[PDB]
Design a protein around this nucleic acid. Sequence first.
DNA 1: TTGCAGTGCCCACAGAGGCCAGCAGGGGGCGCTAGTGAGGTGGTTTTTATATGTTTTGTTATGTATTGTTTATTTTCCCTTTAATTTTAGGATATGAAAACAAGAAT
Length: 125
Amino acid sequence: TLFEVVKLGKSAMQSVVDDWIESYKQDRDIALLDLINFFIQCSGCRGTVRIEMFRNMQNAEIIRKMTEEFDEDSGDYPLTMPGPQWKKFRSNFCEFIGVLIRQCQYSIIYDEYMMDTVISLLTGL
DNA sequence: TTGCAGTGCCCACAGAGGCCAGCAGGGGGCGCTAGTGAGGTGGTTTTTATATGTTTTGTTATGTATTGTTTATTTTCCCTTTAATTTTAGGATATGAAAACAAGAAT
């Protein structure tokens, strides 16, 4: 529930950034799954990415499936819904990306693992 | 004149072939109808589309609460100066205790 944790009043953004760093050092797959799930539920898609469906089958059919499994109740998406709670949601989202990527610049960002999948999925979407 | 060898004629029943009704062969043209097949029109609904009313969303303005700012009255740390207050002899007191005297008592 990293989408909800980042959204619903995160006390310290660097704290959950370090939590994601610790989970990635523990196991790359689960932290990558959590980051992808965070991005998908940040896109307004209420579908949840699973371990095998992230690991095995590719990103374009993931995009097609989440287009089929968007599960909307309205046409609005979290980038345009009214204001306050969602405005601070968007700010926390941007700051989480910035702090998470910038904090790993010393040793983690040269493992050549997360950026391939992240770039592929984000480019496809 | 006759017997014999050969001819004439008349009939008749077969023999034959045209005449004729009967009958079957292939094909042309009409009287009439059941049964679909398709095409056109009308009705129905229906579905898209359009417009109106209500409500939801976004924007604006006012009031309250929070943070900051130079005063500003504590307040408090640090002097130099007294006002109790304490300590050390120095003399006087007192209350005791021997010491001498005087008074019973004994020898």
